[PDB]
From a paper:
Here we describe a data-driven process for the high-speed, automated creation of stable protein designs. We describe a computationally efficient neural network, the Evaluator Model (EM), that is able to predict protein stability with high accuracy, based solely on amino acid sequence. We describe another neural network, the Generator Model (GM), that is able to create novel stable protein sequences at high speed; these sequences can also be successfully refined by the EM. Finally, we demonstrate via low-resolution methods that selected examples fold into stable structures, and report a high resolution crystal structure of one design that matches the expected topology.
The design began with a requested secondary structure fed into the GM. EM-guided refinement then changed two residues to tryptophan, which raised the empirical stability score from -0.18 to 1.88. For one of these highly stable designs we obtained a crystal structure; this showed an all-helical structure, consistent with predictions of the Reverse GM, CD, and AlphaFold2. Two of the three helical segments observed in the crystal structure match AlphaFold2’s prediction, with the third helix taking a slightly different trajectory from the prediction. (C) Crystal structure for nmt_0994_guided_02 (dark grey), showing that it also has the three helices predicted by the Reverse GM for its pre-refinement progenitor. The prediction and the crystal structure have a CαRMSD of 3.4 Å. We found that one such model (trRosetta) could predict the crystal structure that we obtained for one of our designs with reasonable accuracy (CαRMSD of 3.7 Å), including correctly predicting the secondary structure and the relative orientation of secondary-structure elements, despite differences in finer details.
Residue numbers in the entry: 1 to 62
The structure:
Amino acid sequence: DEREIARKVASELQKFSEWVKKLKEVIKKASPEQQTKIAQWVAKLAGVRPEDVKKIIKAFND
């Protein structure tokens, strides 16, 4: 069903947006060395590239 996937994806979008903002606040308080380090933790845990974590964070600032 299309409307149920849309309802589910949008709900997870609102929840995941909260965690991106918290990760942003942790990154905004970190030194440039720690910012790279935090992006490498998230990438190594989630199984993505460190650059993808930054592109995902970019899409949740607007």
